[PDB]
Amino acid sequence: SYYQMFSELVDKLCGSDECIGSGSQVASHETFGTLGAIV
């Protein structure tokens, strides 16, 4: 065929931590996204 979680880690990844790394939340004037990698 071709056709919401609550924990401490999710809270840390969304702005409750003290560092920036893989999995963090990034945003622009409309949408959101996940940080891919450090290069």
Report the nearest approach of its own copies to the CB of residue 17 (Å).
7
> Considering beta carbons, is residue 1 or 16 the nearer one to its own copies?
16
Positive or negative: CA dihedral 32, 33, 35, 39? negative
The total number of residues written for the chain in this structure: 39
Give, as ranges, the residues between 1 and 39 that touch its own copies (CB under 8 A). 6-8, 11, 15-18, 29
Strand partners, 34: 25
- CA-derived radius of gyration, the chain: 13
Report the nearest approach of its own copies to the CB of residue 33 (Å).
15
In the complex, the residues that contact its own copies under the rule CB under 8 A are: 6-8, 11, 15-18, 29
